[PDB]
Design a protein around this ligand. Structure first.
Ligand code: A1L8K
Length: 285
C-alpha cells in the first residue's frame, strides 16, 4: 500500500504540517512536522524517501525563500537536512528521473529563475544542468519518456501557457506545443503516458479547467474540469487516478481533495484535508 503525503503549505502563514492520506480507508496520519515551515515547496520520492524542496517561510516576522532540501523517512518518522540547492527557489517545480531530483525554476525575492539543478541522493550533491529557455515560477513539472517537461508558470512579467522539455542525454531544452490556457500555479502530473495540467491562474481567473498533452500528436486537449477552481494546488497520481489537494480559489484556502478517473473522465470529491491550505508539496510512497 502507498499513501499520499502532503507537506507544508500556507494558511495565514507558511505551515509545517506533514500528513499522509490513505485512499483505501479515508484516514489522515499526522506525521513529524517539517523543521522549518514552508509554502511553495515541491515534494517527490526517491527510494521510498520523501523530499521537501525549496519554498518560502512567510511568517509574521518576515519572508525567507528556501534553498533547502529535507528528507523524510516514513520508516523512522524523522526529517533530516540534505545538501541545499545553489539558490533559494520558491514556487518551484520538481521532477525525478532515474532516482535524481530536478529542481526547476522558482523565485528568490524578485529573481525568477530559468536555472535548473539536479540532486543525486547517492552522493548528497546538487549540480546545475542547462537552464530553461524561459524563467518560470509557479511552474508545473512532468517526467515522461525520460524527458523533463516544465509547463506554464510566470516569467517575472507574464503568466505563461508555454511549455518546454529537457533532454538529459543532450543536456538541452526545446519549446513544445503551448497549452490552450495560460496557467500560473497549476498542478501538473503524468498519468497513462499523458501530461495533465489542472487549475492555475490565467492572469484574471482561478481555473477549474484541466488539459492533457498527448505526446504522439503534440496536442493539448481539455478533459473534464474540476468541481472547484484552484491555484497553488497539490497534485499527485495514486493507483491510476489523479488527486488534487487544496489550493486557493481567490476567496478560500481549500480543504477539498478531488480525484480524477481517466476511464470515466470524471472528478469526484473524496475527502477533505484536515485544514484548508494552499502551496503544499505532495508525493506518494
Ligand atoms: C495575504 C493572503 C495571501 N494569499 C496567498 C498566500 C500564499 C499562497 C501560496 O500558497 N503560495 C504563494 O503562491 C504560490 C504558491 C505555490 C505555487 C504557486 C503560487 C503562485 C500563486 C499565484 N497567485 C495567483 C493564483 C494564486 C495566487 C494568488 O492568486 C493569483 C501566482 C500568480 O499570481 O500568477 C503565481 C504563483 F506561482 C505558494 C497563496 Cl496561493 C495565496 C492570498 C493571495 C490571499 N491573501 C489575502
Amino acid at each position: 500500500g502507498r499513501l499520499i503525503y502532503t507537506a507544508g503549505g500556507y494558511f495565514r502563514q507558511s505551515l509545517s504540517y506533514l500528513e499522509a492520506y490513505n485512499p483505501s480507508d479515508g484516514t489522515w496520519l499526522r506525521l513529524a512536522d517539517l523543521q522549518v515551515p514552508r509554502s511553495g515547496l515541491a515534494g517527490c520520492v526517491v527510494g521510498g524517501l520523501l523530499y521537501a524542496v525549496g519554498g518560502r517561510n512567510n511568517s509574521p516576522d518576515g519572508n525567507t525563500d528556501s534553498s533547502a532540501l529535507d528528507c523524510y523517512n516514513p520508516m523512522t518518522n524523522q526529517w533530516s537536512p540534505c545538501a541545499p540547492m545553489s539558490v533559494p527557489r520558491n514556487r518551484i517545480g520538481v521532477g525525478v528521473i532515474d532516482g535524481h531530483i530536478y529542481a526547476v525554476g522558482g523565485s528568490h525575492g524578485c529573481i525568477h529563475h530559468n536555472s535548473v539543478e539536479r540532486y543525486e541522493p547517492e552522493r548528497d550533491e546538487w549540480h546545475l544542468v542547462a537552464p530553461m529557455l524561459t524563467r518560470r515560477i509557479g511552474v508545473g513539472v512532468a517526467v515522461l519518456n525520460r524527458l523533463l517537461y516544465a509547463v506554464g508558470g510566470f516569467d517575472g512579467t507574464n503568466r505563461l501557457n508555454s511549455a518546454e522539455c529537457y533532454y538529459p542525454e543532450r543536456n538541452e531544452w526545446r519549446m513544445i506545443t503551448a497549452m490552450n490556457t495560460i496557467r500560473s500555479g497549476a498542478g501538473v502530473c503524468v498519468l497513462h503516458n499523458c501530461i495533465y495540467a489542472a487549475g492555475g491562474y490565467d492572469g484574471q481567473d482561478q481555473l477549474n479547467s484541466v488539459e492533457r498533452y498527448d505526446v504522439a500528436t503534440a496536442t493539448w486537449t481539455f478533459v473534464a474540469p474540476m468541481k472547484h477552481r484552484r491555484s497553488a494546488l497539490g497534485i499527485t497520481v495514486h493507483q491510476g487516478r489523479i488527486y488534487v489537494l487544496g489550493g486557493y480559489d481567490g476567496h478560500t484556502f481549500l480543504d477539498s481533495v478531488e480525484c480524477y478517473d481517466p476511464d470515466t473522465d470524471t472528478w469526484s470529491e473524496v475527502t477533505r484535508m484536515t485544514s484548508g491550505r494552499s502551496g503544499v508539496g505532495v508525493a506518494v510512497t
